[PDB]
């Protein structure tokens, strides 16, 4: 239960999707692969599972190479995106099929299935068939299958994907309690950043086959390695303002906004490998923006959209300077009419800066929980 | 475990192919059976284990008769000239002529040991054997006698029960000739018709004429030191049957004519069977229609009736002057279409009949295949405001044809060689006038080639038809690969 | 239950009639045979609807002799129920054999990789386009020489006829292949991770999900074998070995045209495939 | 491969096969050997093909015309009847079954076509073909028809053709000159052109088979018909008051039907030649055996002299023999097969109207000689 | 355009899946049906659409009755959950399908197609086929079809259900800006309470085929009618603590907590209609720090979700089988298992009866 990759590579014909990637996943670590649709989350998971070949590179699980080893003999169990429930078999048989075939032990099955069905609450549906079960129930059957199998490593391929928002939120808690109870390694594919931040001890952001960044939830959030990881993590997306670089210092970097009021501001950020007169993206999360009265760097424009979430208010502002509405976020309700003028404060301490290639300038402001 | 036992059979039965001649069926028996043990033993060629037994049948009962019947094209295989050399000379050696005369025989028991008695009506004097035992070929040297045999005469059942042992007894008179069992009441001097010496030369014993095997025509024949012994034997004839197809004018004219009918028949059939089948398939699973299950089975019932009886009942119903279709057809109309005498009308009958047989297969196809279309396309079409005819031609049809294409080119190939329909209904249709070989107007290529080989009159040349079957097959192979 | 436009009945009512006219037209041929089987006298031509019912034709079909007032006990000319059984044997066993072979073969094509699979399947289809009617001589020869070594599958045996039909499976392999390629991969992948061998996946996962298409294939093979004439009559010489296909043509000698008897046997020969359709209501 | 221990017999369905089966029971009662009488369709067609490969029945029944071809192909075993048996049958019947001075079949009975008329409809049956059109109109307006018989088979239509001059093979004092054929000549065309004119004037239908004609006569719907002895059995059953008389004359000359002679051959491949001999000689060709067959379906004028003199007192058989003497014996040679097929084609094409009588017979003429 | 329902009912012969329910959807009003799966959201939309029949009651679109009227002549369009794209046709042919049949117009199609293709960015995908397109692209082609039709009412059966979360988040902004541009009535089915809150001018919550409550998102949020509506709407689920009633003044109602220390607190709530086992509703966001408020709720920290923007903390309060969830902006350093307390303000607490119905809060929440 300690999977690890070294220069792993996949290619369909001459098309090389993923250049040599490395991962060091420790014992009992909740790892989460994240990215858009078709960025190589599932291919990785399936390459780990043995369902897909490795074109080049070493895959170890428990310090032993697994490339040529078939999926069955990898000490690994998968929860498929479609659940992969055998329609003809019952729920109990769906969960036990693996250990039913090869060493059929009636009493062993009965015990393992019922004990797993106890913790997942599938006890009263063991004699049912996959068609009868609701999606939420159907999902926990696919989970049970791996729990009954008791693999060293767990693989989950977008497990909460086809579930109701409310039920998707509830299952996250179940998976977090399920993980730290069993305490075994879990590799977890998903597109939702929300699911990564809460479940994962380590996250792997995948940009079209390339590994964008590997690290802890709060490390990725506070210190993205590039514009991609910055834009990917965040309930509402980060605001990216086109800014020209004007000056530089050892402890900070100065940049010029794209507005007619060409205001300038020093950011506490790695100045190493940056040039003056360069065009860059100012990163700033909707949550970190302050009210106008507080900060000195004001940003003012017409409000287009005002989403009242109850617990907070999300305001989209048309700044007549950048053609990309600035998203503001604030707790409690904020009575703001749509079409009305609204100003917001930009705090320099909470500002990212990404180069032409997209690489983030390493922030210098220390943040909590890192 | 079982590789040895099966491995022994591959050798036990395989060596018996080498013995008793049969080189023709000796190689394939080893090759195919060795591959099975070669595949099923080791687990490197695992994929072939699932394919082997299926392709074994393809090899044996499809490919072999094809390869075999192509070899028949390079020879004069016919009704007259059918057997091999060893069977043909064995047929000639088996027959016999009556040299002596008939003697009425009897069978009389003397304890366990039986006793035979013959009677010559020309002389009146009778003869009788000693106490012999049944079993094996034995020569009973008979003795003349005035007295009667002891023990009662054996009834027919008893002498019938010992027919096998009594036929092998080759009795002979004191100074007469040899004699064997001819019936259950008579012995007569049966002797071989021919005798085969060292070299291949049979010679008649009755007439006194020698025969030599002429291996050009494939018969035994005599030379003036002519008669032709017509059991006949097969012999190779290179590129003669094939060249006759290109040479013969009478054969060549209808050969392409029927090809037009064959292709058109199979095209029209496929179109109508699909059209009717698909339309019915849509209607049967149409939301609003009531008696779906009742309508569904009734439309399938034709398919529950075997083709060959549906054809033969239609053969009766479609009679021209009589028959029940025209009995009605000259009631609501005033016409009686010549369903058998007229080529076109007979072709219309074939198609009308064939559609009746063919549509259920297509319906059952389109029914299940139509459920591959998701409902929300029609619901989306309902929002747009499409009618039934618009739903059919704009959604259903163009969406059904794509998966249905392979099945309906496979349906084309079936009808292209639909032999049973033509033979049973029309037997080729109205005869094409002025032809060398037998040809009709509703004949397919397969029927025409069958008509040549088998049908009485107009020749029974299996070798010629075998050439045409090869000549067609390779053209369809050249057509299919390019397509 | 969608809300329907422009009256609906305009097309719903008119459809019922069109179907009613169609089922009438297509059933009509079969209505004749039933009527002919109840028609007194054995003539090819007679009244449309029987003047009086006649159980003679069915009696001798079922195997009973019939004493007429005139010409004594005329016995049943043919063992029809024997033939019926022989038709069901040869078709049913052949159909199970064709499913077993084609399904296993199609499993290899659908999933397993081995070079020259496209050319093999394409070849199989191409070779099958040669008609078995133009083989006979080679087939008779095949089963004549094959008979003396293996008696139970030679000439004049039901085994021989079955083994003949086992060859043609190109369409079955392709159609079952296409079905397999439709099926969700996660099941077989899950099964692989569960430790199931390729066979265990074939048997325990793939096959039970493929019951419907196998049921179809069986029926099509069954119907094919029931209606097969050219080969059956080439192999089956004895009357007690005949199937319907062979034996049912013995009725219609022009000079002894047993038309009414044939009709009784003909209605009875539709029974096996109907049972199959009825038993295939699953 | 023919089975030893039993006797398989083949005989056409129109003959009394059930009667012959009773002679089989009588054979089995004394010998213990089962006799199986089958009656396959196209029996005479099938035997040639099965016999050459070793298959076939032990005994084969047909008219003597197809036996020369069978014997020449090497299919028939030469029969071996002693002097005492040959003198039991009429000499001319043996001559019908003699091929190259060798007896190739047991002759059973002499067949011959006769005019079968209905007394209640037609008390005075035509002596001429020419008066049938007139008689047809008389019966047509009455609701019946004059004459319905089989036009599909030459056997039935040849008597009219050959009447005025037509012939198969000219008998060159001792032998049939096979290159001399009389289907093309004016005598054959006359009778054929007459028959066509009967169809052209709606007196008959070109598509009228045995079963249609039989149905018409046996249900009292036609006044006359043309058929052999075998057909009387069904007419008795229908109880249509009928009479068998001489065939009507065409252009002065009388109808000259081909006289058949039902004959039993022995397959050369049969392993029961000794049992076949007994059955035919001592069981079939006796008074009792022939009566058993004749009681099922009339054989005509039998070959067995003893049973013939008993049966000759039948006025139908006297008429059958009258037509037989007026006609001529069927050649037994191989080329008779060629003769029959080509004439069937000629008659059907001419009667259907696809060809002229001249052209149809001209095509036939060439098919015989080639 | 002004769609409205009067005691509309649905059933399948006997069993009533959807009760007699009323809706009054005004002109140009964005309405969102919410609830779990199989609770009769799509059934309602399809009954409005005409894809399903109305077992009983009366439906009105543009103030004329439509129960018997077929879908095509209802002046309505639908975006289907599976997009309902014709796979044998291209995008352009898909979008123009509606008016291609019935009034064949070459120039009118090209205009409306390219007009809608512009705003959705499907101009380069016009020639493509649905199989070639991505989930996001196909989803836009589906809406593009209804936009080319230009119906007075828009029906959408979970249009963003299968897209990525990031793309789903993005497509709500596109939907809102599209709706306020056209200004036409939209009915929008979704399971995601977040989508309703962000999109809806009027939320209709459904509980097993029954309208629980109707009103503005912020109205349903602050004032739930019953325990389900309260439990449904809210990012993390509302905390429910069983409590015993003690006092019952005319102005406000009091309750007793189940904790070892039986604390008491007054709650400003409708007291019309003691010792009742009521549920104390309170959202994680409305909970305070323990140093501020006088009502404290200490427990053991079970799970800590560090979301970056906030920290959601689950607290095992004694004498209750329900982890009290807490929520606070920015990151908060707390260990899994450490002792932690939080404040409970009485001004922000909901109250529910044994049956499930909620006592109306008298606290004047801003927004309503
Ligand atoms: C030779 C062709 C004729 C075949 C003879 C068949 C014998 C019966 C005669 C039928 C005559 C047509 C009468 C049809 C009357 C319409 C009745 C009706 O209105 O019923 C329609 C049924 O569809 C439907 O077959 C739509 C109706 C089909 C009409 C099309 C007929 C011509 C088709 C010719 C093309 C053949 C295919 C060519 C292959 C290359 C209603 O459809 P929808 O509401 O969209 O259903 C939706 C459901 O499928 C969703 O689950
Ligand atoms: O080719 C199509 C038809 O072929 C077959 O009929 C053929 C026969 O094989 C030939 O032998 C010949 O038939 C002759 C027959 O040789 C001759 O004996 C006589 O048949 C009489 C018979 O003597 C009498 O006993 C009774 O059975 O009536 C018979 C007539 O029906 O005359 C026959 C010719 O009429 O030629 C025919 C074709 O002309 C095959 O059996 C047919 O089914 C097939 O259509």
UniProtKB/Swiss-Prot annotation, chain B:
GO BP annotations listed: DNA damage response; maltodextrin transmembrane transport; maltose transport; negative regulation of maltose transport; negative regulation of transmembrane transport
UniProt topological domain (Cytoplasmic) ranges: 42-49, 285-296, 371-403
Membrane-spanning residues: 1-19, 23-41, 50-75, 254-284, 297-314, 348-370, 404-430, 462-483
Organismal lineage: Bacteria, Pseudomonadati, Pseudomonadota, Gammaproteobacteria, Enterobacterales
Annotated GO CC locations: ATP-binding cassette (ABC) transporter complex; enzyme IIA-maltose transporter complex; maltose transport complex; membrane; plasma membrane
Family: Belongs to the binding-protein-dependent transport system permease family. MalFG subfamily.
Iron is among the record's keywords: no
InterPro entries, per database record: MalF_N (IPR035277), MalF_N_TM (IPR048464), MalF_P2 (IPR029345), MalF_P2_sf (IPR047103), MetI-like (IPR000515), MetI-like_sf (IPR035906)
Protein name as it appears in the record: Maltose/maltodextrin transport system permease protein MalF
Molecular-function annotations in GO: ABC-type maltose transporter activity
Effect in UniProt of substituting residue 354 to K/H: No growth on maltose
Residue ranges annotated for the ABC transmembrane type-1 domain, each copy included: 259-483
Gene3D superfamilies: D-maltodextrin-binding protein, MBP (2.40.430.10), MalF N-terminal region-like (3.10.650.10), MetI-like (1.10.3720.10)
Pfam entry (one): MalF_P2
Topology relative to the membrane: Multi-pass membrane protein
Places the protein is found: Cell inner membrane
Residue ranges that the UniProt entry lists as topological domain Periplasmic: 20-22, 76-253, 315-347, 431-461
Listed result of changing residue 379 to A/C/K/L: Reduction of transport rate
Keyword terms: Cell inner membrane, Cell membrane, Membrane, Sugar transport, Transmembrane, Transmembrane helix, Transport
Note: When MalF EAA loop mutations are made concomitantly with MalG EAA loop mutations, a complete loss of transport and complex formation is observed, except for the Gly-385. This suggests that the MalF-MalG interaction may be important for the proper assembly and also for the correct function of the transporter.
Swiss-Prot record, chain D:
Gene label: malE
Subunit note: The complex is composed of two ATP-binding proteins (MalK), two transmembrane proteins (MalG and MalF) and a solute-binding protein (MalE).
Protein name: Maltose/maltodextrin-binding periplasmic protein
PROSITE patterns (UniProt xref): SBP_BACTERIAL_1
GO biological process, one term: detection of maltose stimulus
Alphabetical UniProt keywords: Periplasm, Signal, Sugar transport, Transport
Principal location listed in the UniProt entry: periplasm
Taxonomic lineage from the root: Bacteria, Pseudomonadati, Pseudomonadota, Gammaproteobacteria, Enterobacterales
Induction (UniProt): Induced by maltose and the transcriptional regulator MalT. Permanently repressed by cold shock in a PNPase-dependent fashion.
Entry's localization field: Periplasm
């Amino acid at each position: 239960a300690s999977v690890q990759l070294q220069n792993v590579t996949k290619a369909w014909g001459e098309v090389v999707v993923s250049k040599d990637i490395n991962l060091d996943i420790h014992e009992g670590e909740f790892v989460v692969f994240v990215g858009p649709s078709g960025c190589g989350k599932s291919t990785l998971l399936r390459m780990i599972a043995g369902l897909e070949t490795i074109t080049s590179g070493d895959l170890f699980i428990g310090e032993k190479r697994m490339n040529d080893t078939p999926p069955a003999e990898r000490g690994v169990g998968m929860v498929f995106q479609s659940y992969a429930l055998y329609p003809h078999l019952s729920v109990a048989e769906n969960m036990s099929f693996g250990l039913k075939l090869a060493g059929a032990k009636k009493e062993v099955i009965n015990q393992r299935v019922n004990q797993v069905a106890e913790v997942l609450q599938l006890a009263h549906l063991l004699d049912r068939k996959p068609k009868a079960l609701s999606g939420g129930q159907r999902q926990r059957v696919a989970i049970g299958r791996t729990l009954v199998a008791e693999p060293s490593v767990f693989l989950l391929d977008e497990p909460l994907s086809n579930l109701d928002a409310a039920l998707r939120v509830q299952m996250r808690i179940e998976i977090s309690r399920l993980h730290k109870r069993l305490g075994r390694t879990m590799i977890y594919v998903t597109h939702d950043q929300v699911e990564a931040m809460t479940l994962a001890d380590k996250i792997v952001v995948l940009d079209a086959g390339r590994v964008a960044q590997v690290g802890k939830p709060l490390e990725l959030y506070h210190y993205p390695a590039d514009r991609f990881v910055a834009g990917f993590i965040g309930s509402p997306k980060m605001n990216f303002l086109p800014v020209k670089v004007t000056a530089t210092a050892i402890d900070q970097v100065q940049v010029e906004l794209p507005m007619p009021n060409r205001q300038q501001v020093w950011l506490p950020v790695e100045s190493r490998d940056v040039q003056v007169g360069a065009n860059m993206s100012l990163g700033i999360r909707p949550e970190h923006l302050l009210p106008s009265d507080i900060a000195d760097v004001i940003l003012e424009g017409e409000v287009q959209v005002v989403e009242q979430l109850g617990n907070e208010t999300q305001i989209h502002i048309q700044i007549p300077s950048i053609r990309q509405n600035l998203v503001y976020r604030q707790n409690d309700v904020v009575l703001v009419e749509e079409g009305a003028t609204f100003a917001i404060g930009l705090p320099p301490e909470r500002c990212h800066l990404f180069r032409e290639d997209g690489t983030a300038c390493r922030r210098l402001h220390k943040e909590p929980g890192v | 475990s079982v590789l040895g036992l099966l491995g022994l059979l591959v050798g036990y039965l395989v060596v018996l192919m080498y013995a008793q001649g049969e080189y023709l069926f000796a190689i394939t028996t080893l090759i195919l059976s060795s591959a099975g043990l070669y595949i099923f033993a080791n687990r490197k060629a695992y994929a072939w284990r699932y394919v082997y037994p299926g392709m074994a049948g393809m090899g044996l009962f499809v490919l072999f008769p094809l390869v075999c019947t192509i070899a028949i094209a390079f020879t004069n295989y016919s009704s007259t000239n059918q057997l091999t050399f060893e069977r043909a000379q064995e047929v000639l050696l088996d027959r016999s002529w009556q040299a002596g005369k008939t003697y009425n025989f009897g069978l009389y028991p003397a304890g366990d040991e039986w006793q035979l008695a013959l009677s010559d009506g020309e002389t009146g004097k009778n003869y009788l054997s000693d106490a012999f035992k049944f079993g094996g070929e034995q020569k009973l040297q008979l003795k003349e006698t005035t007295a009667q045999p002891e023990g009662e005469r054996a009834n027919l059942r008893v002498i019938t029960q010992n027919r096998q042992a009594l036929s092998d007894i080759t009795a002979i008179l004191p100074d007469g000739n040899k004699v064997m069992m001819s019936s259950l009441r008579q012995f007569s001097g049966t002797q071989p018709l021919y005798t085969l010496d060292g070299d291949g030369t049979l010679t008649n014993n009755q007439s006194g004429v020698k025969y030599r095997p002429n291996n050009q025509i494939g018969f035994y024949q005599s030379i003036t030191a002519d008669e032709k012994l017509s059991p006949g034997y097969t012999v190779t004839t290179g590129w003669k049957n094939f060249t006759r197809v290109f040479t013969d004018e009478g054969i060549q004219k209808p050969f392409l004519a029927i090809f037009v009918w064959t292709v058109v028949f199979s095209l029209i059939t496929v179109f109508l069977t699909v059209a009717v089948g698909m339309v019915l398939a849509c209607l049967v699973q149409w939301e609003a229609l009531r008696g779906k299950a009742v309508y569904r089975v009734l439309l399938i019932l034709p398919y529950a009736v075997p083709s060959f009886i549906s054809i033969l009942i239609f053969k009766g119903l479609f009679n021209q002057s009589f028959g029940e279709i025209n009995m009605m057809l000259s009631a609501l109309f005033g016409v009686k279409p010549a369903w058998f005498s007229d080529p076109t009308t007979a072709r219309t009958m074939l198609i009308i009949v064939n559609t009746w047989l063919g549509y259920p297969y297509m319906m059952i196809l389109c029914m299940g295949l139509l459920k591959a279309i998701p409902d929300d396309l029609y619901e989306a079409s309902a929002m747009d405001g499409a009618g039934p005819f618009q739903n059919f031609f704009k959604i259903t049809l163009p969406l059904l044809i794509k998966p249905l294409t392979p099945l309906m080119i496979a349906s084309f190939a079936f009808n292209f060689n639909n032999f049973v329909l033509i033979q049973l209904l029309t037997n080729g249709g109205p005869d094409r006038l002025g032809t060398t070989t037998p040809a009709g107007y509703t004949d397919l290529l397969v029927n025409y080639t069958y008509r040549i080989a088998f049908e009485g009159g107009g020749g029974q040349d299996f070798g010629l038809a075998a050439a045409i079957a090869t000549l067609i097959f390779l053209l369809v192979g050249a057509l299919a690969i390019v397509n | 239950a969608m809300v329907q436009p422009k009256s609906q009945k305009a097309r719903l009512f008119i459809t019922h009639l069109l179907l009613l006219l169609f089922i009438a037209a297509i059933m009509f041929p079969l209505l004749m045979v039933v009527a002919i089987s109840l028609r007194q006298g054995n003539f090819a031509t007679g009244s449309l609807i029987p003047e009086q019912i006649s159980w003679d034709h069915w009696k001798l079909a079922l195997g009973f002799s019939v004493e007429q007032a005139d010409g004594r006990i005329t016995p049943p000319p043919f063992p029809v129920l024997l033939w019926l059984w022989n038709s069901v044997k040869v078709a049913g066993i052949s159909a199970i054999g064709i499913v077993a072979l084609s399904t296993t073969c199609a499993y290899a094509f659908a999933r397993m990789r081995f070079p020259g699979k496209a050319t093999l399947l394409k070849g199989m289809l191409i070779f099958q386009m040669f008609p078995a009617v133009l083989s006979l001589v080679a087939l008779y020869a095949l089963f004549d020489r094959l008979g003396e070594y293996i008696p139970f599958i030679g000439l004049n045996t039901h085994g021989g006829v079955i083994f003949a039909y086992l060859g043609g499976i190109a369409l079955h392999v392709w159609t079952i292949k296409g079905y397999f390629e439709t099926i969700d991969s996660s099941l077989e992948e899950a099964a692989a991770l569960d430790g199931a061998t390729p066979w265990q996946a074939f048997r325990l996962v793939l096959l039970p999900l493929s019951v419907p298409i196998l049921a179809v294939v069986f029926i099509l093979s069954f119907i094919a074998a029931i209606t097969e004439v050219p080969v059956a009559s080439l192999l089956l010489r004895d009357v007690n070995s005949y199937t319907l296909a062979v034996g049912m043509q013995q009725y219609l000698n022009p000079q002894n045209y047993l038309w009414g008897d044939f009709a009784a046997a003909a209605v009875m020969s539709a029974l096996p495939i109907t049972i199959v359709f009825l038993l295939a209501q699953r | 491969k023919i089975e030893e221990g039993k006797l398989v017999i083949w005989i056409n369905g129109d003959k009394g096969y059930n009667g012959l089966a009773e002679v089989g029971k009588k054979f089995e009662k004394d010998t213990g050997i089962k006799v199986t009488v089958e009656h396959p369709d196209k029996l005479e067609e099938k035997f040639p093909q099965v016999a050459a490969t070793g298959d076939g029945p032990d005994i084969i029944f047909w008219a003597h015309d197809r036996f020369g071809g069978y014997a020449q192909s090497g299919l028939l075993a030469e029969i071996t009847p002693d002097k005492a048996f040959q003198d039991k049958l009429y000499p001319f019947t043996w001559d019908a079954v003699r091929y190259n001075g060798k007896l190739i079949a047991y002759p059973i009975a002499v067949e011959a076509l006769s005019l079968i008329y209905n007394k209640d409809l037609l008390p005075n049956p035509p002596k001429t073909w020419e008066e049938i059109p007139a008689l047809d109109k008389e019966l047509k307006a009455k609701g019946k028809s004059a004459l319905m018989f089989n036009l599909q088979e030459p056997y039935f239509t040849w008597p009219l053709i050959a009447a005025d001059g037509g012939y198969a093979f000219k008998y060159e004092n001792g032998k049939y000159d096979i290159k001399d054929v009389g289907v093309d000549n004016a005598g054959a065309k006359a009778g054929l052109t007459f028959l066509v004119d009967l169809i052209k004037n709606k007196h008959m239908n070109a598509d009228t088979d045995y079963s249609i004609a039989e149905a018409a006569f046996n249900k009292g719907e036609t006044a006359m018909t043309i058929n052999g002895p075998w057909a009387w059995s069904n007419i008795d059953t229908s109880k249509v008051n009928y009479g068998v008389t001489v065939l009507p004359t065409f252009k002065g000359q009388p109808s000259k039907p081909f006289v058949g002679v039902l004959s039993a051959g022995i397959n050369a491949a049969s392993p029961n030649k000794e049992l076949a001999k007994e059955f035919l000689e001592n069981y079939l060709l006796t008074d009792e055996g022939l009566e058993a067959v004749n009681k099922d379906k009339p054989l005509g004028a039998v070959a067995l002299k003893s049973y013939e003199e008993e049966l000759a007192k039948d006025p139908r058989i006297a008429a059958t023999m009258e037509n037989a003497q007026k006609g001529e014996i069927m050649p037994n040679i191989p080329q008779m097969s060629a003769f029959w097929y080509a004439v069937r084609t000629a008659v059907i094409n001419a009667a259907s109207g696809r060809q002229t009588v001249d052209e149809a017979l001209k095509d036939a003429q060439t098919r015989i000689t080639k």
